[PDB]
């Protein structure tokens, strides 16, 4: 996020990081329950990647994090790679996340829910702060 | 360019119609724009949350998807519209 600000450690408990075998963070995710993570389809997650929950400082070795194996990738059949539409993938974890003060789920809306233009929302992540 | 510590930013939701002004035909029903406010999601943010607080809790309204190749803070960021996809999510959890 460009022009963001550092979050209070553990205040976005559903925020997970998707890491490759090399420990490289390549995408964000959101816990919706102890066994499922919502992410973007274009993230191209594979069962060889790992879900990392409870992190604040990806550089710290002293945080109580949870490196969770992925049991299965569920890419929405409606996903269109060409237009990046219906960009959502579900990740079923092999072993359930242990919820804590720093690891919990985000709520999901109802299909009929209205989110009006002008509403102020928040986005979080470890993406570039400078392009 | 890449932060160690988790970043956050407040940003407004745009209407698809208004968003089409910036992105045109790239904008589909299953997409929701936010930003163009002095902040921008960027490479590595993808798949993360776009949450809105109401009646005390945070709801996933969007999923970081795409935007300006430059992460311009004056162009709206494009997120996967969760309302358009929540039915699929629920079905998927139900069946698995």
């Amino acid at each position: 996020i460009v022009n963001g600000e550092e979050a209070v450690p553990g205040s976005w408990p559903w925020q997970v990081s998707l890491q490759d075998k090399t420990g490289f963070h390549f995408c964000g995710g959101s816990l919706i329950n102890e066994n499922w993570v919502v992410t973007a389809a274009h993230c191209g997650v594979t069962t060889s990647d790992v879900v990392v929950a409870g992190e604040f400082d990806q550089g710290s070795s002293s945080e109580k994090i949870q490196k969770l194996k992925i049991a299965k990738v569920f890419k929405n059949s409606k996903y269109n790679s060409l237009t990046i539409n219906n960009d959502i993938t579900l990740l079923k974890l092999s072993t359930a996340a242990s919820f804590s003060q720093t690891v919990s789920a985000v709520c999901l809306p109802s299909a009929s829910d209205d989110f009006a233009a002008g509403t102020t929302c928040v986005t979080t992540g470890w993406g570039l702060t400078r392009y | 360019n890449t932060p160690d510590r988790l970043q956050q930013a407040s940003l407004p939701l745009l209407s698809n119609t208004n968003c089409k002004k910036y992105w045109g035909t790239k904008i589909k029903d299953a997409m929701i724009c936010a930003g163009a406010s002095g902040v921008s999601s960027c490479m590595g943010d993808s798949g993360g949350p776009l949450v809105c607080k109401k009646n005390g809790a945070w709801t996933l309204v969007g999923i970081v998807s795409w935007g300006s190749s430059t992460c311009s803070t004056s162009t709206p960021g494009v997120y996967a519209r969760v309302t358009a996809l929540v039915n699929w999510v629920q079905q998927t959890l139900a069946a698995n």
Binding site: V8, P9, W12, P13 | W58, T59
Partner: peptide, 10 residues
Amino acid sequence: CGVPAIQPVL
């Protein structure tokens, strides 16, 4: 869901 134990500060 949706209520952080540790409240985020915007």
